[PDB]
Structures are given as C-alpha cells and as structure tokens.
C-alpha cells in the first residue's frame, strides 16, 4: 500500500541504497585476503556465490509471501519461470565471461546499453509500441551513461552481444508474464530464483565449485559472516528490482538499474566536491535531459 505518485521514487531509493552496499560487500568478499602470501588462496568460486545469493533471495521471497500478500494464487505457468531463469543465467554467465576478451567496450557498452535491446526486443516480439520521444529519451540516456563511465578482429566480443540479447529476451519474458498472467512481484522473484538455484546447483556439482568452496570456507570461516550479509543486501535490493519491473515494466527497471551507477557517482562527487572531468559534464547533462524529456513532453 503506497501512493502511486510516490511509487517510482520509493523503488529508485530502495534500489540505489541497497545495491551500493551490495557492491561494497561483493568487492570485499571477492577480492579477499584470507591466507598470507602464498597462502592467500584468492576467492575464485563466483558461481557458488551466485548460487548462495539465489537461494537466499528465494528464502527471503518465500518469507515475504507467507507473512505478507497472502491469499493469492500464482496463475503463472511454470515454463515461463523456467525460460526467464535460463535467460537470466545465460546473460549473467556471458557477461561475466566477456571480461578477458574486450578492452575498450569492457562494460562501457556491455552495460550502459542494457535498455536498448530490451526495448528493441519488446518492439519486435511483443509488438509493443512507444512514441518516438521514448526512443530519443532512451538513446540519450544510454549515450550519456556510456560517455560518463568512460575511463582513460572482434572475435570474442560476440559474447557481450549474446549477453545483451539474452537480457532483452529476459525482459520480454517478464513483460509477457506481468501483462498476461498478472504475476505478482514476490511470486516472480521466488520462482525465478528457485529455477536459477536449481540450474546453478546442477552446474556447481562439478568439483570446481562446490567441493572446493566448502573446504575453502572451512579454512576461513570469517567469510561466512560477510557472505550472509551480502545475501541480505541482495534480497532487499532484488525485491525492489522485481517490484518496479512489475509496476513500471522491464524497460523502466533497466533504465533505473543502468542509471543507478551514474547517479551514485554524481552524488558522491558532489558530496566530496571531487573534480569530475570536463568531458563527463556532457554525459551527465545528456542523461539529465533525456530523463527530463522522458518524464514530460514525450512521456
């Protein structure tokens, strides 16, 4: 129960606040120091981290469903949840596996171009329609974010394009689910996370992750603590992510999640008065203008 006018601001604030700590703790865990010198045994089990995060999110979603928003049948077909989960997992795998093949568009275009495919896919598969103003706003936002994040044969770059396409397919599936089957945010989150948990669990049964991460954690129990908190930091952060997509759509969710980093950096610079580069002023101005035109005069 929230006012409609103060709905989008709530989602934006929630995601922005949650994912900042999410990233901080992800860095603290993945980087790690553990042993000393050669004993370091740097953390390399990313898939196990994603699996733990997925199971934690599923548990939190089940808690939310049982304690609140009860008496509501799902009405959604399971195969749709499975399709969304496979698309999400494939996109994440491809994105994580493209780091060591791309240098210039290394997350500059892999991310900051998240909306376009989704939007385009929505136009093609679901035959949706948006005003030309929306196209211009999305393009301006993407260009501004990409130009702001810039930091001082093309064979392997296909992986990033495949990741973007899979993300677009996931957005299309989510839009179809919410439009036709009236699936709730919590139900969608729980089912998608359960399917992803099953897939990842099947994946990590190979000795590389499970029977190695277990022993490694036994060596350094402290990590567990951080891990747990990280999981929580995802849950809340994921909740809003799976709420806005239901209330305003995958396109709005993608715009929020792709401009969150730029907003956070701008706010941190303003608070610290850091001397942002003169070029990046162009990117922030473009993003601001695109958002303004999206909100009004072409919404």
């Amino acid at each position, epitope marked *: 129960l929230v006012p409609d006018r103060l709905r989008l601001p709530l989602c934006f604030l929630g995601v922005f606040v949650c994912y900042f700590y999410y990233g901080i703790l992800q860095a603290k865990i993945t980087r790690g120091k553990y042993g000393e010198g050669a004993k370091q045994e740097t953390f390399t089990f990313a898939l196990t981290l994603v699996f733990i995060q997925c199971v934690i999110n599923a548990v939190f979603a089940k808690i939310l469903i049982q304690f609140f928003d009860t008496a509501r049948v799902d*009405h959604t077909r399971s195969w749709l949840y499975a399709a969304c989960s496979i698309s999400y997992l494939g996109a994440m795998v491809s994105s994580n596996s493209a780091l060591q093949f791309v240098n210039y568009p290394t997350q500059v275009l892999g991310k900051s171009c998240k909306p376009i495919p989704v939007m385009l896919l929505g136009v093609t598969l679901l035959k949706k329609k948006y005003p030309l103003a929306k196209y211009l706003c999305v393009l301006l936002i993407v260009a501004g974010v990409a130009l702001f994040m810039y930091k001082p044969v093309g064979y392997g770059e296909l992986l990033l394009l495949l990741s973007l396409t899979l993300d677009g397919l996931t957005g299309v599936s989510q839009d179809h689910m919410r439009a*036709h089957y009236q699936t709730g945010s919590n139900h969608m989150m729980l089912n998608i996370n359960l399917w992803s948990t099953l897939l990842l669990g099947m994946g990590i049964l190979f000795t590389g992750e499970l029977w190695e991460f277990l022993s490694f954690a036994e060596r350094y129990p402290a990590i567990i603590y951080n891990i747990l908190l990280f999981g929580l930091t995802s849950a809340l952060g994921q909740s809003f992510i799976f709420m806005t997509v239901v*209330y305003f759509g995958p396109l709005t969710c993608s715009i929020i999640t792709t401009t969150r980093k730029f907003f956070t950096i701008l706010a941190s610079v303003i608070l610290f008065a850091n001397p942002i580069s003169p070029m990046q002023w162009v990117g922030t101005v473009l993003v601001f203008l695109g958002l303004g035109l999206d909100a009004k005069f072409g919404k």
Partner: single-chain antibody
Amino acid sequence: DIVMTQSPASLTVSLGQSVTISCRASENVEYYGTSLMQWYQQKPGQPPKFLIYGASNIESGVPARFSGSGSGTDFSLNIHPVEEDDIAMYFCQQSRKVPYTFGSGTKLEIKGSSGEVQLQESGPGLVKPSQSLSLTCSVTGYSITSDYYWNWIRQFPGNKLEWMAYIRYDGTSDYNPSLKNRISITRDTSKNQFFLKLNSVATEDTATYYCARAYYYDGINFDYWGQGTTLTVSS
C-alpha cells in the same frame, strides 16, 4: 467486491443493425495496462458460451462479427452485422478480484417475435432447508490433474450468475469470500470427478448449478461448460 452494471436491460434490434452493449465496473479493472474483462453469450436453456477475453481479444472460433472495446471502468461489446444466431443474453465478467462477478445480463431480441472435454453434473433435485447438499461433476475425455481450472457456478432465477469456487489441478482452491464459510470444494482424481458440498442450504440457494473448465489468460475464462443441474430448496 466489484459490481458490474449493464446499462441496457433488453435491446430490441432489427436484422443487420449494429448493437452495442455497455458494461461498467464499480472500480478500475485494469492490471498493468490490460483490461481483465470477459464477455459470454447464453442462449435460452443453455450454458453460457465464452466469447471474448481481455475486453478486445475474440476467442478462437467466435465469428469476426463480435468485437470488444473500452478501458478503465467502461466497456462495450459490438456486433455490427447481427443475424438470428446472435440472439441470447450477453454477460460481462470481471477477473480483477477473487470474487469474480457477472453482470446482470443484457437480453437481445428481434422485433416481431473423446476429442473434447465433457462435463456432467449430478445431485438431488429437491432438498429441505437446513440440510446438507453435495453435487458431483464428472469429467470425461480429460484428466482433472492437467493444467485447467475447474469451477462451480450457479445461476439464480432471473439469470444472475455467481461464481461459487474452483479447484485447480494442483489442488489449490479458491472460494467466494461470501460463501467461503458455507461451501467446500473437493476432488477425487481416481474417478475423475470433483464435488461441491453446501451446508445448511436455505431457500435462497435455489438455482441452476454448472461445473465449468476455465484457463487463465488475461483473466479467468470459463471456456467449457456443463449442462447445468437444477436445485430447488423448499419446505
């Protein structure tokens, strides 16, 4: 609960004319840009026939004459080239909230006057007040353990429909909150049947009970219907 109102109680039209039936809801029935609205057609002495879902999507097999329009709390059903076939009562149903409600129904009249699923209901025709009643709907040509909702509906004298409850193939059941305390829906997969039990039936309960099969898509759509069983409560 949402109250559906059909403005024209009965329309007198000639052959070939265009007819528009208006249905209004007490609350917005849109859920993320989609209108959870359904239109059914019921010929005399026959179960209602599913026509439209989503307020604009014509059900497969329905003639192209029928068309739906509207949004928000106002909807309309249009049949431009009307013929003698489309002479019946037209009902508007909302699937926005759990207590699915049907409109009062609009009567349309002319001047001058193993390859499918089969449902069959059984039960006593006459029951004394305050007794317990149990109706059975038997399904043939299909299994009630497959992906389809199995609903119980009742039509009172005057053609005022009312959705009692339903049981999904998963075993999950939903009830009308008004009747949740009085009725109980169960199933028996071994015999491929499902039963509705009512406790302390009153004189008001007199009605014709149908058991229907529905699939959820832009709202619940009672696509297949049984033949209906009459129930009379008298002293």
